[PDB]
Design a protein around this ligand. Sequence first.
Ligand code: ALD
Ligand code: MG
Ligand code: MG
Lengths: 235, 240, 195, 231, 222, 212, 244, 233
Amino acid sequence: DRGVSTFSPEGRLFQVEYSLEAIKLGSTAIGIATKEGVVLGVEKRATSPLLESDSIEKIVEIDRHIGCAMSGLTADARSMIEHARTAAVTHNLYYDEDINVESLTQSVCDLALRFGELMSRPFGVALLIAGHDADDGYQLFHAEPSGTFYRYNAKAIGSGSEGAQAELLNEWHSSLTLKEAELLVLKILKQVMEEKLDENNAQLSCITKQDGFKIYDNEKTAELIKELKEKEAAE
Amino acid sequence: GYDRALSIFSPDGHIFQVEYALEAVKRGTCAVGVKGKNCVVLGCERRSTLKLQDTRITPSKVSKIDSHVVLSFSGLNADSRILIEKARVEAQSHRLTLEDPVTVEYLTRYVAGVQQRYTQSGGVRPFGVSTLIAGFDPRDDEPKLYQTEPSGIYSSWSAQTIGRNSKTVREFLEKNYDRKEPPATVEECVKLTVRSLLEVVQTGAKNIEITVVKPDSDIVALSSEEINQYVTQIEQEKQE
Amino acid sequence: MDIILGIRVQDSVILASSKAVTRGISVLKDSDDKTRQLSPHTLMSFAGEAGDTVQFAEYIQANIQLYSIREDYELSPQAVSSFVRQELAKSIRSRRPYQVNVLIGGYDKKKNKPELYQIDYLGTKVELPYGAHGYSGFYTFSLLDHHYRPDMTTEEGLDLLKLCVQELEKRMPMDFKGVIVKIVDKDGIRQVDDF
Amino acid sequence: NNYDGDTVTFSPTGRLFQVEYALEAIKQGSVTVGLRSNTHAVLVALKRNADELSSYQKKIIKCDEHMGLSLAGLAPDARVLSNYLRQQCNYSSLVFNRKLAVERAGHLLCDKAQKNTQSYGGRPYGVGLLIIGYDKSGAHLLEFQPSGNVTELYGTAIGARSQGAKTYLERTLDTFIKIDGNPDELIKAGVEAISQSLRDESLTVDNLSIAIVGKDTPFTIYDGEAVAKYI
Amino acid sequence: QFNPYGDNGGTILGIAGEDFAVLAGDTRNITDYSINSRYEPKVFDCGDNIVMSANGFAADGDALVKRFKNSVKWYHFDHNDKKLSINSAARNIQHLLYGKRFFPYYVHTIIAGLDEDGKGAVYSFDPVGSYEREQCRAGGAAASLIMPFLDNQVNFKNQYEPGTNGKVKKPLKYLSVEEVIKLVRDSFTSATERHIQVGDGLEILIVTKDGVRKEFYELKRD
Amino acid sequence: TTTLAFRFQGGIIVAVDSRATAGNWVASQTVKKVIEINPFLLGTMAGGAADCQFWETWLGSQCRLHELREKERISVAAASKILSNLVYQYKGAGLSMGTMICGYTRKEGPTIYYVDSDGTRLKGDIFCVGSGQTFAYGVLDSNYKWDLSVEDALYLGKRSILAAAHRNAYSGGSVNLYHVTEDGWIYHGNHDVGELFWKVKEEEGSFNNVIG
Amino acid sequence: GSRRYDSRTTIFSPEGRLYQVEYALESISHAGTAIGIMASDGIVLAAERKVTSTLLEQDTSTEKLYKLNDKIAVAVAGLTADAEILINTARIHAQNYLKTYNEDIPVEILVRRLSDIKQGYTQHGGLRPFGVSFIYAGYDDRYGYQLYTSNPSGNYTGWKAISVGANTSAAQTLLQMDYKDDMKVDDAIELALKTLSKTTDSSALTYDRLEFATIRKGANDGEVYQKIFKPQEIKDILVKTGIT
Amino acid sequence: TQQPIVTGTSVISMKYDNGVIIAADNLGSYGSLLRFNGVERLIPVGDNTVVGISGDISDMQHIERLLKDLVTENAYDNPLADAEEALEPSYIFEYLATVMYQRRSKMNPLWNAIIVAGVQSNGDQFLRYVNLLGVTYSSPTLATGFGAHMANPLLRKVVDRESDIPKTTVQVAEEAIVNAMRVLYYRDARSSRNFSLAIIDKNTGLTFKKNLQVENMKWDFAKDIKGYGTQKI
Ligand SMILES: *[C@@H](O)[C@H](CC(C)C)NC(=O)[C@H](CC(C)C)NC(=O)[C@H](CC(C)C)NC(=O)OCc1ccccc1
Ligand SMILES: [Mg+2]
Ligand SMILES: [Mg+2]
């Protein structure tokens, strides 16, 4: 057939480029960074109404100061999360401190290109890694299966990504509050989702310096959805 | 060692070997899982192409992983034994180190993790098996029902079916199962499970297997006559 | 010396095991249960080096429980004892051997007979009407040589066992803080809470 | 065509296509410039962003107190190779109490990249590097290609539109080589050199990335408002 | 039979101030009854405003210091030139020592610097990695001579206020850098008199927010 | 070293001394022999200082990883068994550890496990560990009752350490007290023996063996 | 490199089938028919040798029926060489169990182990599967007399009467017709031979073209005897049943 | 772990104003047997370094080969091998010190005591010691074995501290070294009269002197010594 670590004539790795197509088929995930915190939101996308939606775990804690959202082949993310959690805890053991968000992201991205003929193929999942540290403050990173990671003020990944990113382009400014960011994630998720957005098929989360990483209750998100509807009807 | 990458991405972002493993599940005999208010029932299809079978010794479709958790499946039978064995070993290993039996979610997460591992490991093909894992957590009366598939994704279900003609029985369950009020008793839950299989099975003789799991390690398999009584009652009500 | 005794009567096997855990100069505990249920009709008592005893017992327990789930069937006491012996016989030539002596008391549901197996850390197995490990046997064997019958009842077996414990409490130098007694019969395993 | 399936296969004209395809990844990468005088050596790198919300991808990596490089192509491959250099620089210090020569650093990179071009299963590195450093024989600038070829130069540039900056340096050769004991003027020449490779976009405060090493100057990287002086 | 360990003598001393910290050590190096060197540095600037000394078997001490300096270097590479805090350094050194739990670095290690609030910090280690933050610590050959003196003159132990007769203790007034160096010099002068492995020279490393400064003083050469 | 822990009506009392020795040489009077693993878990240290410190801070990392993976806290049984299984791997290599893993969970209640470098793992209501265990046992055992007040229990534990600090040469320095309830542990201060001894002697009227 | 020449023996088709397993089953369908019939008082194993010669030494020959232990035997259908690899593994597994537990191995446990080995060759290793189908005839004190079959997929099932190899479709129909639950060994012997006699591709069924075996409790008191029939004994049972 | 068989005794050295001097006798002892009388224990590396080795001779010959191989390896792809990128004393020492400490950590030591004497690129004097334990130290005077006990005291009378180095000429330093070698011949039972001496000067370079002998010895007073106490005749 052909090598797994083969370059295309354009200078790209076939398998990496193909894994990016799998990520485009995945459910939407959005992240927004502010001076008051970072917000992470995802589309759950249940395949059937009998599926208990609360078991869909697409937002995940890595440490108290770092959270993570995923999009694509979500099964592939489990080993990446396990590594991230181990890396975060191990660093605390060796250095008696929290680990920098960037350093955590770099550790996860080192796994990405460890494939050949090590694992047999790249990961088919992208990650939005959000957190806080004392040096660089509130941060949001986008970790790809290419091994590359970009920092972002705001970022959307998944099926409705390019439409959501264009919307984040206009809406984001440096003086956004946490409440404003929460509503903004809900607004954009509702825009790109197939089914109608509610507390059961969408999930919010945030990371603040004081309280750390928190996944939002369905009751708490429901209120923010109701607050959104009213403010859009206000003009 | 044989290191060949069998599971790989295609230009359209698909892993065909994982997707072809799902086709093996589609071929397998139908399996169904329904959870009531205080119980879970696992229904399984037995194809009647094979008669002159010895039903005493033939491998049963529903397998006990521990005294409080069970596992049924659809797909390749030989593949399922490997997952069941690994699951059983991990169950005893968990009891040994944590001094507490596995939760249903934990056991599912393990089996799902094994399935995933076989989708990005060299020299191996994915499992051609989807499982339904059901039971009750230790010292807990809330019913648990989880599903896994070759890709390695898993999730919890109020009710779910897998295997051949699972599209039809899922259609049945989606209209007949109410979340606000699930099957309150064992009878109601078994009846709904047998009904759902009768949409697909053919004859209600030795083609339907039922296994009821209740809290506190109370697992029992229904006999032919017991199931036949459900089959009789369902059709007599249907003649109206 | 961690006193463990065993007696096989007409219709049951009775195991008695000391409660004391002494580390050096102090008795750290006086209510320790030196036994594990391997299967519903098979019980194993143990005594030896600290740490190794429990680690070995729980390891065996896990293996037998695994077998039970896989086959949906309980192994005979004879089969379990042979498995245990092989593990110890394997262990004695290891880098660091398990320093554990055991008694296996079980009721065979097929043959409807109680069975008592004595196995030392070398992997030396013997089936016996009554057995003991360590220094307990120096007092109890000759005493049981005098007072035992194959057709004794469970109650007679317990009285005979009280006689053994009384002798041990009189003539042995350590305070082993009494014993926990367990009976293995056709109905399973149960603990005698007053002894 | 039929001879580009893997790195272990020559073409009928004696070409290695997988290596050539790896070389292509560098041309797609953002521009970076390297130049030196007798006292100092400078790296100037145009950083690239994904969009307006994103950060600008870092191009320059420090290897030791007296050595470092700028990258163009697959960034993860640059991380692997820079990590290897860090270890080799470090082995030289711990074992021999000796700062690693820039020329020897180039030789080690060449040999590491070569093994990936002759063996089945693996792949060539998809990145080009510009290594600067100050050792016992003064200032140095190297150009690394993943074919294995390493070249010592007065000045150079790699990446997209790098031909413009390379021509400028070829004209300015006699001028900038003489810029001794003046770091700011040597950077000015590097900033003016990279400007010849720009189209549409210009050098902004979070776009530009500069690094310098010299006689009494450890390898230091300048980003943000630290390079506003040179805009 | 081959003995992989040796004893190079020497003595070290760390004292923590309110906004500074010192780490002192004699410059003598010995085997048995012979002198190897009258000036062989024992306390090192390890970067990030941290000073370190590993006293006992010099080959093990040099190796450890060398490895920790290397750890600081890679901490910068791996974590965006972040400054290694004294508490993080201490934990890192524990793992370096415990990593050789079954073939130990035969040294008494002490580090000094400033904590993240700017206050003076001293950390003390055993050979296999157990560590503890302290206000005062002597290590090495003459540690048994010096520590009691420091309990008395730094922490005012067994000292009370006259007139009260044992009822009221001496208050724990802070010590200046000038007052600390006096105690260090007297500690080593006294240790030099009564311990044969101590002498030749005294090298003190003082750590402040402004950086790392050195002071050298002569000691008796007999 | 003297460490103790006992179960009672108001939860668990944990009390330890503070001395560290190297032969007859008193190396430290200010060492922390209690490790705050998490808001509901405590570990005691006796034997090898490094061994205890290293592996009990390692234990805290393993307990934290557990609650990340399982979204639920680790049981005292599971936490103690992680440590006991670890030291059992190293058995024969020369580790020297005597520890109590004390804590509270909903399903277990207040629980204490004695974990040993020999591999011994024991559940129990009362434990005293270290070179001074015998001295603490003497006071603790003779005055222990299940129905002590959080105030009387704290004092008994403190008093039991004092007794051992006095008679045992390798114990002393100060007393660190902890109290563990449904809502976690609560520190009850560092108590220097140099002042506590005389205070207790005067108020309690004990220690007549001494000239005061 | 080497990838170019790899057949990829352990992959799914688009339909979700294992290519090599399916093709191995096709190979087995041309092998000599083997029949197993389970009765209340014993088990019969009958099997047809493939187009023999007059110069083949029959009395010392064995291509179909093999002994795994004193209680368990197997009938082979497929590549004989492949079968002997597995047979020797199964013999060892039985002895391992006997050494460990001091009891003869239960039939199903032995069958599961061999079936798991076959499964492995279909999921990993990149090797071709074993082109063999077994009929296991055995006895233990739990389930008594048992018949199983395993095939290259590693899937196994229990049976009252079963055939493997050539003409199984025709053979299974004939067995399904004349088999009854209260049947005895002597009757099962007759059924097995009559079924082979009709399904055979040969002109006539003779003693020299057959291998035959019975597992009977027809041993002196509570115990089980294996009887591998001799050529003269197969000739006699052919006359007795009225085939020759 | 081993035991040393064929052994070399003291190596002595000192710094002076413009460089360093190092010396060692030419003997290879086999226990009490003075077996081999032509052994060179000073091994030059380039024209700026001399390694003096004592202890096991088989291990010395191994080290000799490592240094010879080091020179070969440094020249590879190095146009400045005879100039800016030539081997320095500091490089050579750290290499050996790394090897010695590695070997002791594997419990298989090189049973030696080594002194690396040389002059650096900037003209600075280099003198440092390393032994089988991986222990290292530097001093204005350095000596191994018996030299540590007898030579150091004599050489420290010339250079007692760092400030005495510029005041010390090459003639005074060589005189002190040669005297020390005589004293060792008087008192070390495993020494020989024949020895080698090396000078590394920042101006005049490397001067390697072979086949030197201890001379001007005092023995005449022996004739007057009679008995062990009371013996008049
Ligand atoms: C009391 O049990 C106390 C508890 C600790 C947590 C402090 N332990 C000790 O005091 C203990 C002595 C015991 C074993 C009787 N002392 C040490 O562990 C001691 C602590 C340092 C800080 C003085 N360390 C020690 O003795 O070093 C071990 C060693 C020595 C020499 C070479 C290698 C290792
Ligand atoms: Mg015995
Ligand atoms: Mg002195």
